[PDB]
Design a protein around this nucleic acid. Sequence first.
RNA 1: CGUGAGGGAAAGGUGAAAAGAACCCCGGGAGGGGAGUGAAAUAGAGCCUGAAACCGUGGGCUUACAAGCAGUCACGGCCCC
RNA 2: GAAUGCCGGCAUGAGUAACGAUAAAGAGGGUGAGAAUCCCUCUCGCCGUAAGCCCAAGGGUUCCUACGCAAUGGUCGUCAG
RNA 3: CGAUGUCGGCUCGUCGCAUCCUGGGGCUGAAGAAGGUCCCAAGGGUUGGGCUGUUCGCCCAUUAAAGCGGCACGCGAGCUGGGUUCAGAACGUCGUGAGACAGUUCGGUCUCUAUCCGCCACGGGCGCAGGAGGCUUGAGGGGGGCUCUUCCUAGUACGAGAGGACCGGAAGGGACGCACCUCUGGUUUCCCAGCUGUCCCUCCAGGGGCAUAAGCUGGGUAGCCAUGUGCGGAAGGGAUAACCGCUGAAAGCAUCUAAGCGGGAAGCCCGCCCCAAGAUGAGGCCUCCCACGGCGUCAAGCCGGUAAGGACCCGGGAAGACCACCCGGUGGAUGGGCCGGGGGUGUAAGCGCCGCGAGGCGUUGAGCCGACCGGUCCCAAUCGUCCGAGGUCU
Lengths: 9, 118, 122, 205, 59, 137
Amino acid sequence: XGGPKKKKK
Amino acid sequence: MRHLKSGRKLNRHSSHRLALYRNQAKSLLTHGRITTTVPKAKELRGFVDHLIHLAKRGDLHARRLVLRDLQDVKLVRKLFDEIAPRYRDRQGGYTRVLKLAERRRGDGAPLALVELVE
Amino acid sequence: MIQPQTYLEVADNTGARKIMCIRVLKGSNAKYATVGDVIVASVKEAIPRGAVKEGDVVKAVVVRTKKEIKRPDGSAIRFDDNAAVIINNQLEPRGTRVFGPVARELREKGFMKIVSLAPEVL
Amino acid sequence: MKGILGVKVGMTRIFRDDRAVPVTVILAGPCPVVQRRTPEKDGYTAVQLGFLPQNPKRVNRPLKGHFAKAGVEPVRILREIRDFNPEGDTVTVEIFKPGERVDVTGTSKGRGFAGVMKRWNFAGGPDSHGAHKIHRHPGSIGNRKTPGRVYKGKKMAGHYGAERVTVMNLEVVDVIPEENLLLVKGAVPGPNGGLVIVRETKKAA
Amino acid sequence: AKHPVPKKKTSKARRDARRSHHALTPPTLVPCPECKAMKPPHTVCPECGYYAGRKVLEV
Amino acid sequence: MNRGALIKLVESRYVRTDLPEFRPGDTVRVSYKVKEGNRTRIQDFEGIVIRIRRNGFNTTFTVRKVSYGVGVERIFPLHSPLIQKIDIVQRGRARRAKLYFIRNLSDREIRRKLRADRKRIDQDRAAERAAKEEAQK
RNA sequence: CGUGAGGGAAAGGUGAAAAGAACCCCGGGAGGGGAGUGAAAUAGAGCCUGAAACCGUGGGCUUACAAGCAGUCACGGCCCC
RNA sequence: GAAUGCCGGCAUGAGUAACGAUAAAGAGGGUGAGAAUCCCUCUCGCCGUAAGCCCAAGGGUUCCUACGCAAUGGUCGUCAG
RNA sequence: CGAUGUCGGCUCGUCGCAUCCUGGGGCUGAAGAAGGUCCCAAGGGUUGGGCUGUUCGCCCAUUAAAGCGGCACGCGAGCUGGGUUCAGAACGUCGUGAGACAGUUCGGUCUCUAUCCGCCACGGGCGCAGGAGGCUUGAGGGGGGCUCUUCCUAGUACGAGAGGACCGGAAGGGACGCACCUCUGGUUUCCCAGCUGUCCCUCCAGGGGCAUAAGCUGGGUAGCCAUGUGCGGAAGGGAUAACCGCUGAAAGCAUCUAAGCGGGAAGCCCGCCCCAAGAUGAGGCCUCCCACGGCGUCAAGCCGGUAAGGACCCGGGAAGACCACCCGGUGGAUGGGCCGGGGGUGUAAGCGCCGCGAGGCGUUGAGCCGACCGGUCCCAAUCGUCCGAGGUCU
Ligand SMILES: [Mg+2]
Ligand SMILES: [Mg+2]
Ligand SMILES: [Mg+2]
Ligand SMILES: [Mg+2]
Ligand SMILES: [Mg+2]
Ligand SMILES: [Mg+2]
Ligand SMILES: [Mg+2]
Ligand SMILES: [Mg+2]
Ligand SMILES: [Mg+2]
Ligand SMILES: [Mg+2]
Ligand SMILES: [Mg+2]
Ligand SMILES: [Mg+2]
Ligand SMILES: [Mg+2]
Ligand SMILES: [Mg+2]
Ligand SMILES: [Mg+2]
Ligand SMILES: [Mg+2]
Ligand SMILES: [Mg+2]
Ligand SMILES: [Mg+2]
Ligand SMILES: [Mg+2]
Ligand SMILES: [Mg+2]
Ligand SMILES: [Mg+2]
Ligand SMILES: [Mg+2]
Ligand SMILES: [Mg+2]
Ligand SMILES: [Mg+2]
Ligand SMILES: [Mg+2]
Ligand SMILES: [Mg+2]
Ligand SMILES: [Mg+2]
Ligand SMILES: [Mg+2]
Ligand SMILES: [Mg+2]
Ligand SMILES: [Mg+2]
Ligand SMILES: [Mg+2]
Ligand SMILES: [Mg+2]
Ligand SMILES: [Mg+2]
Ligand SMILES: [Mg+2]
Ligand SMILES: [Mg+2]
Ligand SMILES: [Mg+2]
Ligand SMILES: [Mg+2]
Ligand SMILES: [Mg+2]
Ligand SMILES: [Mg+2]
Ligand SMILES: [Mg+2]
Ligand SMILES: [Mg+2]
Ligand SMILES: [Mg+2]
Ligand SMILES: [Mg+2]
Ligand SMILES: [Mg+2]
Ligand SMILES: [Mg+2]
Ligand SMILES: [Mg+2]
Ligand SMILES: [Mg+2]
Ligand SMILES: [Mg+2]
Ligand SMILES: [Mg+2]
Ligand SMILES: [Mg+2]
Ligand SMILES: [Mg+2]
Ligand SMILES: [Mg+2]
Ligand SMILES: [Mg+2]
Ligand SMILES: [Mg+2]
Ligand SMILES: [Zn+2]
């Protein structure tokens, strides 16, 4: 996983 | 729904199903008895019966029609010569299904007998 | 069956060649318009200098239709086009003479002058 | 109030006064009254009617041959008529004359497990645009925290059809007594072959 | 690893309560006319065979 | 009970038998009863028969004509009491049952595609002359 | 495990002595039942002691008009000392 | 007795979802303690600028054969990498 | 704040009335028609578009009317993601600057698996104290509940004219609801035919595989369907709301009320349709079966082969996810075959004749031919097995 996605929705 | 309809969808598409029926008949015309599952065996009657009734009448047209479902030029011979005349005074029901007592393991399939009648 | 957005052919010499249905006048919310019903329509195409110009919000009676209409005698009839006759608020045709056939449904709804003017009533 | 049993034969269009159709032929064969219910004994008023004969002894022992009319007990003894006390014996079919209005009760065809939007005409989803797998779903089925539950009649999917349906004020177009035939105006429920019962209408009479 | 998820471990009494119908039914069999063996009805007795169309008997 | 259709076939005593045999492709003029306000006038419809869907009684057939620059189709009950008569005007070679296709070429290609049915034509007359020679007594 | 530098586990005990179970029996085996070794065989070898969660089988009481932080306090019946 | 504690063990959801391309299977005969699944024959379908051949890299015994099925195989398995 | 997803749209609704319409009514500066205003009333209904992310609103065409709000500004473990609301970028603007702006602009990852409640469906168990097969009562629920237009009365009443009632009656409609497949019209997956390329069966002829999971095209029964067809809203009875009165005191008169008694709403109760005896308050009627061979010598029972019957199993079914339900199971037409009839295709193959040939014609509406209506024991529902009362007390 490690994210890395930014908090979008 | 799918009410007053007829013919088992045997979890096969149109051309495969047709092929199945067509193969089983070949087999059942060759050995005279066959083992398959019950619904496959309950569907072969109609199909093999009709081909036989066609060999009964005898004419060259009748040959060429049967030949569409059997492709083998012999075997159709066998049909028209040896198989056919055995049923001449019999009107219909050239075939028999008897349910076997043992079930395929690791599958669970109820099996059935299918043989040419007489 | 005609509903709002449907092009109709203009079957009289009022000048217009085609109207588009704006509304069907039966109830508060009629879904469709058949022969003998009255519709409101915008004009979309016309003949130069006629009685009606493009844009003219008009009224008109439906005289032919592609969908077949069923007669209570068990017969039916359908036409190659959808056609209307532009009429005024007295339900009278603002044009003289009408082109091509109209259904008897027209006569039964009281549009006498149309069926007279019509070449053939079927 | 006169009633009788029957099967649905089929449909056809008929011609009378130029105007054509429409009719459902139903044979309302002879019904031999097998019992006559009365307010002194049962507390209400009716007549068990008994329908198609057959039964070469598939009849059990309770049978109720009793009333000397049990001419080899019928298959469908089902249904009385309620507030009906006929000529004492065998309800013919000549009870309905043409012009009369009638009420057929039948058993509707069974759609089985039917989605909402066939069960109930729901609008379902858009066939495109946003889509995502709800093309035929019922949408929302409630509010939020209050009431925090779903209503006790909420139209959802399930076994639709195969039930009792009665359509009223049907016209009798003709009766053919030679063959126990009865005719009406289309609306009659059930498949061909089904048992149906036919009463005079609640409209009046 | 996603959306709906069990709220509370289902207790022992409730697990066993749903298996109240998990029970098997014994196979239904009948005496074979010729041999004394048992056979599920309407099946070709493996040992003896039907009167008419062939037994294909173990023989 | 075992006669569910023979039963239906019984009400159908409205069956017509006077009308001529005809099959799609050939053109036929059908004299039809029409009210036209209180009265009752006998209108004629003459076109190419374009479809016959048989169902015993309540078989229908449909006829197609171009009138005043517009195509019109009419659909008749083969046993409608309103059909006064119906008489063939030319016998055409069909080559297909439902020939809806001609809706999209009502021109020159409509003939030569529906050419004369010589074989059915040379019956229709020679088949009548014998019926003219019989009962001249 | 990581390209690499580097990270880095788990896993001890039959019996005094293998005396580690010949042989027969079911089974294709596995594994059992007898027989036998041993003081002990739930010391039999995925072996000392064998705790709890957990899963079974049998018995006693109880339960299908019933509302539940599951207990507690009263009476009551049944079962065992 | 608690630290979304640490290690280990066993539950719950649950016989539920799934069993990895919708290119497709049917039958006869063998072998076997045991075959939808292994061998053979016949019939059917699929790829064919490949889903066919030959190298390079990488892999390091997977090659051939004999004897085998506890596990590895998403089922079976007499087969096998 | 160890997370309550935040606008609008779609979907599905339901609720309040301080009602937009329809029903009833008082006053009117109400002639009539049409309005104005207030009271009663929510049963039902409350359109489709153009613009904008829009809510709202403005418009277009209608309408009986184009009602207003609550339900986490209802509804994202239902959908959407245009807006808003990350990271990119640009404009205007502010800051020397990095950057900033409910100012703007274009773009921008919406999470397969429901455990408990709840809901829609369907069964398994036990119970209803004798066991059965049927047929039923309806406590109690649910559904439904809309409205327009024209004509007759009469173009009278009313009105100078123009307009034009009530009451009563009739015919067409618009949406909505249940059911249906005769007609209209769809699909119909191998029912038939035509066609192309290619490989094959054997050369010709004739055919087969593949070209989707139908190769393409032309049609098409049943079945399932709406555009199609038939019905439905009611009648009517009873009690009321506002409101209109009768008789009538207290208070000689007067007053609809304080005793009474009437009228009077699409509303209320019932009637119409559907569910419904778990309605443990387990109902009723009709017809079946009856003694216990043995133990508990006592209370309730137990072991047990039987009875009326009922399952198992099998053939099936416009019944159906499984289950259930229903019809059969050979003293039998249930399914399959066969035959007959429908129905669909459109006149097969082979031969003959004409044409150099592609072809055409004849034999011929031929041949082929699923589901539909029937007939026929040719094939399969063989043989059987297992449950099942023997009735507590006044
Ligand atoms: Mg079916
Ligand atoms: Mg294919
Ligand atoms: Mg069904
Ligand atoms: Mg849609
Ligand atoms: Mg989609
Ligand atoms: Mg939510
Ligand atoms: Mg041992
Ligand atoms: Mg020890
Ligand atoms: Mg020790
Ligand atoms: Mg130990
Ligand atoms: Mg109790
Ligand atoms: Mg603590
Ligand atoms: Mg956690
Ligand atoms: Mg752990
Ligand atoms: Mg689950
Ligand atoms: Mg599931
Ligand atoms: Mg699955
Ligand atoms: Mg796979
Ligand atoms: Mg082996
Ligand atoms: Mg290929
Ligand atoms: Mg190795
Ligand atoms: Mg190898
Ligand atoms: Mg394995
Ligand atoms: Mg795997
Ligand atoms: Mg080997
Ligand atoms: Mg917070
Ligand atoms: Mg929390
Ligand atoms: Mg109010
Ligand atoms: Mg007023
Ligand atoms: Mg536009
Ligand atoms: Mg826009
Ligand atoms: Mg808002
Ligand atoms: Mg609302
Ligand atoms: Mg708010
Ligand atoms: Mg909200
Ligand atoms: Mg979402
Ligand atoms: Mg949630
Ligand atoms: Mg956005
Ligand atoms: Mg600057
Ligand atoms: Mg902002
Ligand atoms: Mg901001
Ligand atoms: Mg883009
Ligand atoms: Mg999700
Ligand atoms: Mg809960
Ligand atoms: Mg149809
Ligand atoms: Mg080819
Ligand atoms: Mg060739
Ligand atoms: Mg393919
Ligand atoms: Mg079609
Ligand atoms: Mg009861
Ligand atoms: Mg049969
Ligand atoms: Mg030929
Ligand atoms: Mg036939
Ligand atoms: Mg017979
Ligand atoms: Zn035997």
